[model samples]
Target: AQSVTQLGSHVSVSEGALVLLRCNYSSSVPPYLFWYVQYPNQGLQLLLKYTSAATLVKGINGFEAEFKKSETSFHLTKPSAHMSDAAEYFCAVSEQDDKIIFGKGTRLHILPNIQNPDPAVYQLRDSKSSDKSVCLFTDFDSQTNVSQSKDSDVYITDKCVLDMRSMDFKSNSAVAWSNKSDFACANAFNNSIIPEDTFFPS
Candidate 1:
């Protein structure tokens, strides 16, 4: 089976130091490379991804990664790491389907705490229906009195719900679209309690 390896389980750096998280992959076919991050109690967010072109890819929050075909590595890097950069990072590869095979996460530690948190308090909830659901709201032009037509080619909208419980996550809350935001998708994969850790809390 195809797999990926993340060299480090944890990394620490000064507030303004350079940072690097290593990743390597094995696959029968050329695979898409990606880097994702997760903050405490939040979802995993996509940092960057490498498709076919552009060996060097830049992502949100001053993060960037280079796909080195020779070494079969896609390592994340930054010139100067800020306190806000501290979080758990994962390197992944995707061959087929929307699912990505993930690496064991790497925990990053910054010298000072980056305590600035988004005001939104994410809560876990349950759904009554078996069908997975995601909802999206559309904006209308009141002055023109016109409603927009649904775009057939568009699969991802501002809002989406999915049944991700099949991925082994707890059956709580309406499953949101995985890709509504990079961070949302990351949280679903990393923080879900379904992939229960055998070890007890430290």
Candidate 2:
């Protein structure tokens, strides 16, 4: 029979700090080992798996675990911790007969009062003109285009308005007029609008 023993029942880490969880297993032969995490009200998420490959396995969110056959241990580590990382972690071992055993869970607690920096707003400039005619917004981590213009047509896509407001920008209420009376318009506020052929005369 194969079994797993977790060295720690609970672990706490400050925001943006490193985290470590220790585990040990016993088996007659080399066995498969896995690490899983459980978020509140969510199903178990596989963090990393070790079968018979390299000793180090990289996982999501700057997490990585090293498998040591000599010490009969597998330790998990994360370079940094976010508030959303607070969850229960488990380590499991698979026997030769395919019987799997799990170690007692370890609860991860994140320190409080860590806030993310405010997002930055960027202006999207058209190549045809020198003036800034559109808004290109970002949540400080990623970029999203809120409003854009191509030739004489304007596009207003879903989440574009909300993304603009997230960066403390004004809404897309003003309209740019061209010399031609037949202005092409495309609306993707709630649904997708095909750019290949979909257009309307204003």
Candidate 3:
């Protein structure tokens, strides 16, 4: 039997505070320990893995975890937390059997230091075959224009300020930003409109 227990379902730490996410495991024989992270709408990435080498293991983004065999614990730690550290973490274990078991996952939430403003990216996209052709990230840190890619019109604000964060768009103009980036043009149409004209060819 092999398993991992994450001490907390969710762990919160303020900006620049020391972080600790605890894990304990059980196995019938020598086991391998691993820490994995999943960011918002992103894939799982290996943070670090521990075998019989050293008790302390260093990992990405200044994070580290220690393997304490005596306590059957491998707790992750970071000297300080960053807003970008918010994500779900998994403690995984496996034996020579190669049957890896993952913990339920611990969600780490980082409280921001409001004193520091962050950058924001606003995008206008359409799920249809085509999208808007250009954009202007107007008058923030500096006025900049972008020729849209084949798919999306994305504009990342330059070191956004506390004044406000917004995107300039007009219904009469060609592009629009949506909170839900995956919505298709058809999604905006009401069924009562009767498909303006069907058989347009998918």
Q: In lDDT terms, which candidate is top?
A: 2
Q: List the candidate 3 regions with Cα displacement exceeding 4 Å.
A: 115-202
Whole-model lDDT, model 1: 0.59
Which 10 successive residues of model 1 have the least lDDT summed?
137-146
Candidate 1, residues 1-202: lDDT per residue as tens digits?
6889997687767556788889999976669988888998999888899988898899976778988888888989988877567689999999565678999989986543223311111323338753333322211111111122233322333211122446522111223233233323223322222222212121
The list of candidate 1 runs beyond 4 A from truth reads: 96-98, 112-202
lDDT of 3 by residue, 1-202 (tens): 6778997887778767999999999875658899999987999999998978988899988889998888899999989986667789999998557577899999996654453222222234446665442222222221212233233433222222122326221111113233345644333222112212222212
TM-scores of all predicted structures: 0.53, 0.54, 0.56
Model 2, poorest ten-residue lDDT window? 188-197
Residue 46 lDDT in candidate 1: 86
Hey, what RMSD does candidate 3 come out at?
13.1
Sorting all predicted structures by lDDT, with the top scorer first, yields 2, 3, 1
User: Given candidate 3, what's the lDDT at residue 75?
Assistant: 93
Q: Any residue pairs clashing in model 2, and if so which?
A: none
